[PDB]
Symmetry: C4
Subunit: 140 residues, 4 copies
């Protein structure tokens, strides 16, 4: 029996339970976005603004249900409408991470027919981050 | 007249007002669990999650009565159902404290007829803890 | 025109706007307690528990009116019932401040006919305190 | 496409999106106050009291609408009623910033006919402030 650690074991939604995505694996996800005609977009956040929190609820009556702070991140430029080139997306990942080397960065994609985000995964975390585990240290 | 110190004098429920339990005294408590046919279990928590707090109440209407965060700790493996061997319990204490040397660890036991925890006491605190006093410094 | 500074200028209720009390001035206040047959008592608090605050109100409905945390401090021993000796009070000030050299300490007195505290002033603040001004620096 | 940075990019209301005001530009704003017969005044705040916050709302029922802490700053002396001399205002700026070199300081002016503040801009921030960007680093 192995024990799932509660300490410094924060996750990041889709694909965070898999081994970290290689460049080849990221390119494959980008190909999938393009193949489906979805709209790629990059979003970023400083460390303090990365995980869901409750601070604004101090201002509320009994209306906190499904309200959380830090769901919104900051948009990198604009969604890439009309993008049919995976290399353009990869170049924007490089540009965003270069401009904000200490930020969390996630790649998302939108479907304008359902009008909903249809994919999303983390592509950068700050080097100072100490609040997560390697796959093989997730259980002790 | 001696004065009970209010400063860095945090307690830990059952047996925290006695001298710290020796290995022999811990073994005697484990024998008592086994003699009564209760279910031993270990639970642990990082320092920040060890004592009762109020943070989630920011999300509440007027319903905080008997709500506290940090009552639940994290289960080490599973409760030791069918355990009739005190040495097995003592070995799990060693294993748990080895895997989490910086955590608070408590031994508990369950009665499945009353369906309630029937015993409980601290077996480890982190070495960095400075929020408690030795027996002879609890009063000044 | 001089300007009353808002920065690090915390006060401590009765007598805090006067020059700090000398040992002779403290002795005179003790004489007043004894002369009136009031009950002297010492109370103390660590720095974080010294000034009025709001933290418990996170648990409340709309009932915070005239509720503040940190109004209660910790009693040194017991109120000195029957005390007819000013020197006994001065000795307890020495004893309390010796036991808690980093605490805020205040001398209070009770009237049991009105059943209310009838005097009170600070007799010690921690040496590390940086949130108050000497008299000649309260205006700039 | 340049990206407006969300990190350490705090603003300070009127004129904060322009290049920092030169001494000549400040003098011109003061001339404008005097020309219109408005009442000049200086206000200041320590760093922790400079930006709007919500802390007091812990005490509230459902009445936080348009309540914020830190809207009030501290008045330097009194508003300069009857002041028709721009050099007097500039000397008070010097005097205030000298007395409080580590404070935020803003120049304001009042109209007593409308009874409202009619102009306002920051004239000093503490040298330790690291939550703002120079004009050429606001976008990346």
């Amino acid at each position: 029996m192995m024990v799932w650690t509660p300490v410094n074991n924060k996750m990041f939604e889709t694909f965070s339970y898999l081994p970290p995505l290689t460049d080849e694996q990221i390119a494959a996800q980008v190909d999938y976005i393009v193949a489906n005609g979805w709209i790629p977009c990059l979003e970023f956040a400083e460390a303090d603004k990365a995980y869901v929190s409750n601070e604004s609820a101090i201002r509320f009556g009994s209306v906190s249900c499904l309200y959380y702070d830090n769901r919104y991140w900051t948009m990198w430029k604009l969604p890439m409408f009309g993008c049919r080139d995976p290399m353009q997306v990869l170049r924007e990942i490089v540009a965003c991470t270069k401009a904000f080397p200490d930020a969390y960065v996630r790649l998302v994609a939108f479907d304008n027919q359902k009008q909903v985000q249809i994919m999303g995964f983390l592509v950068q975390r700050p080097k100072t981050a100490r609040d997560f585990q390697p796959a093989n240290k997730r259980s002790v």
